[PDB]
């Protein structure tokens, strides 16, 4: 290690690093190699977290770290202390590009494909999800960018399940996702097994998975403008949606023009927050 | 109250006992055996001479520095050659003198603050080592909000 500074003992190197700030730390990290690795040392962050934990005057429900019995115990006898530093620092927001599981009968019964419309929408910059994680055994999903700001990812499940019945790959999706999208068929001619769909929704929205009160956007959807529509108040009321007691919204939608989608998506993003 | 300190190459240094105990590393050897001369196999003479100067200056005060502004005198004391600075950083660590460690490490820290790196890079002779594309990936990843 030709650098006088790189050769020092790690104990002593971290001690030096203890007087810096996260911003500094990133510049030093950008020297690459070791420094990038070591600037992120779990131990340095424990020290920072323990220090400065006692300097913060707010703690929301979404940010109170696991047992302080666990945050504050023997170094070895968790992490990513850096990540935990971030959630707890009340002046810092960790970053996230929401992902949503889109399933529903509406994806296949409508004579115009919604999915194939979302895919051909100049306005949302749909682009193949990068293998960079984002993979599962279902694909990377499709990234979209709402009016050049909020980016999000949708995993379109064309077949969910085989009572529960949630397929296993699908449960990996149910846990890592932030919200759900259910594409109901609002076309007035369609006969429904409301109870089935409600069950099927539930099955997927199951709290044993990613628990939380993850929002459910349901797209009351029809092929195009001229098709006679079931009003959404009545649709919402047929799927028994009153029972889910966790955020939901039924947004009317047209496969062809995507009329209504953009309002619906805006709602789901704003719902997921921290 | 006089104690013998033996450099890494013998050398002198007859310091007052309170001044030597200031290094825990020493205080604990003085309790192993009588230890008359005191062998310090890591610290040379040049450095130990500095170390004694620093200790004799702070003898009558210790407590609570940490992230307190480096005092004016220490600032001068430390206007030394870079390699010499790190040599102090090691003596402090070897002799376990917390105050000297605080102030030497903090001065090193203050050098890194506010650099590109490319400055941080020149300053400490550190190996670039990110291949062509390696950069952006660490540079976007190391943009602390």
Curated annotation (Swiss-Prot), chain A:
Biological processes, Gene Ontology terms: cellular homeostasis; cellular response to ionizing radiation; cellular senescence; common myeloid progenitor cell proliferation; negative regulation of fibroblast proliferation; negative regulation of protein localization to nucleus; positive regulation of protein polyubiquitination; positive regulation of protein ubiquitination
Subcellular location(s) of the protein: Cytoplasm
Entry keywords, A to Z: Cytoplasm, Phosphoprotein, Ubl conjugation pathway
Family annotation (PROSITE patterns): FBOX
UniProt modification remark: It is low in resting cells and high in the S phase and the G2/M phase of the cell cycle. Phosphorylation is decreased during late G1 phase.
Pathway involvement of the protein, from the record: Protein modification; protein ubiquitination
Pfam (any one): F-box-like
GO CC annotation, single: cytosol
Signal peptide start-end: none
InterPro entries: F-box-like_dom_sf, F-box_dom, FBXO4, P-loop_NTPase
GO MF annotation terms: protein homodimerization activity; ubiquitin protein ligase activity; ubiquitin-like ligase-substrate adaptor activity; ubiquitin-protein transferase activity
Location of the F-box domain: 2-48
Name the record gives this protein: F-box only protein 4
Source organism (scientific name): Homo sapiens (Human)
Swiss-Prot record, chain B:
Positions bearing Phosphothreonine: 116
Molecular function, one GO term: ubiquitin ligase complex scaffold activity
GO CC annotations, alphabetized: centrosome; Cul7-RING ubiquitin ligase complex; cytoplasm; cytosol; nucleoplasm; nucleus; PcG protein complex; SCF ubiquitin ligase complex
Role description: Essential component of the SCF (SKP1-CUL1-F-box protein) ubiquitin ligase complex, which mediates the ubiquitination of proteins involved in cell cycle progression, signal transduction and transcription. In the SCF complex, serves as an adapter that links the F-box protein to CUL1. The functional specificity of the SCF complex depends on the F-box protein as substrate recognition component. SCF(BTRC) and SCF(FBXW11) direct ubiquitination of CTNNB1 and participate in Wnt signaling. SCF(FBXW11) directs ubiquitination of phosphorylated NFKBIA.
Pathway linked to the protein: Protein modification; protein ubiquitination
Keyword Transferase: no
Transmembrane segments: none
Post-translational modification: Undergoes autophagy-mediated degradation in the liver in a time-dependent manner.
Cross-link Glycyl lysine isopeptide (Lys-Gly) (interchain with G-Cter in SUMO1) per UniProt, renumbered positions: 127
Stated family: Belongs to the SKP1 family.
One annotated GO biological process: positive regulation of ubiquitin protein ligase activity
Keywords: Host-virus interaction, Isopeptide bond, Phosphoprotein, Ubl conjugation, Ubl conjugation pathway
Record region (Interaction with the F-box domain of F-box proteins): 89-145
Protein name according to UniProt: S-phase kinase-associated protein 1
Superkingdom of source: Eukaryota
Subunit relationships: Interacts with KDM2B, forming heterodimers. The KDM2B-SKP1 heterodimeric complex interacts with the PCGF1-BCORL heterodimeric complex to form a homotetrameric polycomb repression complex 1 (PRC1.1). Component of multiple SCF (SKP1-CUL1-F-box) E3 ubiquitin-protein ligase complexes formed of CUL1, SKP1, RBX1 and a variable F-box domain-containing protein as substrate-specific subunit. Component of the SCF(FBXW11) complex containing FBXW11. Component of the SCF(SKP2) complex containing SKP2, in which it interacts directly with SKP1, SKP2 and RBX1.
Organism whose genome encodes this protein: Homo sapiens
InterPro entries: SKP1, SKP1-like, SKP1-like_dim_sf, SKP1/BTB/POZ_sf, Skp1_comp_dimer, Skp1_comp_POZ
CDD domains: BTB_POZ_SKP1
């Amino acid at each position: 290690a030709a650098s006088t500074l790189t050769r020092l003992p790690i104990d002593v190197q971290l001690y030096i690093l203890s007087f810096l700030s996260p911003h500094d730390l990133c510049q030093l990290g950008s020297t690459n190699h070791y420094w990038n690795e070591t600037v992120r040392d779990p131990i340095l962050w424990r020290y920072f977290l323990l220090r400065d934990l006692p300097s913060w005057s707010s703690v929301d429900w979404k940010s109170l770290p696991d047992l302080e019995i666990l945050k504050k115990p023997i170094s070895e006898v968790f992490f990513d202390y850096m990540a935990v530093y971030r959630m707890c620092c009340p002046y810092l927001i960790i970053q996230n590009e929401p992902r949503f599981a889109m399933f529903g009968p509406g994806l296949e019964e409508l004579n115009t494909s919604l999915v194939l419309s979302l895919m051909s929408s100049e306005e949302l910059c749909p682009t193949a999800g990068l293998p960079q994680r984002q993979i599962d055994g279902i694909g990377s999903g499709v990234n979209f960018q709402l009016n050049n700001q909020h980016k999000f990812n949708i995993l379109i499940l064309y077949s969910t399940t085989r009572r529960y019945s949630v397929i296993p790959q699908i449960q990996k999706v149910c846990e890592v996702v932030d919200g759900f999208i259910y594409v109901a068929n609002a076309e007035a001619h369609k006969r429904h097994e409301w109870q089935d769909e409600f069950s099927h929704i539930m099955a997927m929205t199951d709290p044993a998975f990613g628990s939380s009160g993850r929002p459910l956007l349901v797209l009351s959807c029809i092929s195009q403008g001229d098709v006679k529509r079931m009003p959404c108040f009545y649709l919402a009321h047929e799927l028994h949606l009153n029972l889910l007691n966790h955020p939901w919204l039924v947004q009317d939608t047209e496969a062809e023009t995507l009329t209504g989608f953009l309002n619906g998506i805006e709602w789901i993003l704003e719902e997921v927050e921290s | 109250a006089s104690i013998k300190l033996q450099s890494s190459d013998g050398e002198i240094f007859e310091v007052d006992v309170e001044i030597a105990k200031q290094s825990v590393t020493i205080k604990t050897m003085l309790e192993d055996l009588g230890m008359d001369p005191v062998p310090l196999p890591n610290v040379n003479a040049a450095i130990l001479k500095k170390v004694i100067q620093w200790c004799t200056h702070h003898k009558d005060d210790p407590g609570g520095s940490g992230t307190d502004d480096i005092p004016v005198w220490d600032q001068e004391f430390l206007k030394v050659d870079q390699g010499t600075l790190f040599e102090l950083i090691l003596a402090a660590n070897y002799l376990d003198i917390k105050g000297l460690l605080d102030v030497t490490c903090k001065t090193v820290a203050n050098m890194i603050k506010g650099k590109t790196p490319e400055e941080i890079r020149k300053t400490f002779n550190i190996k670039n080592d990110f291949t062509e594309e390696e950069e952006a990936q660490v540079r976007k990843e190391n943009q602390w909000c």
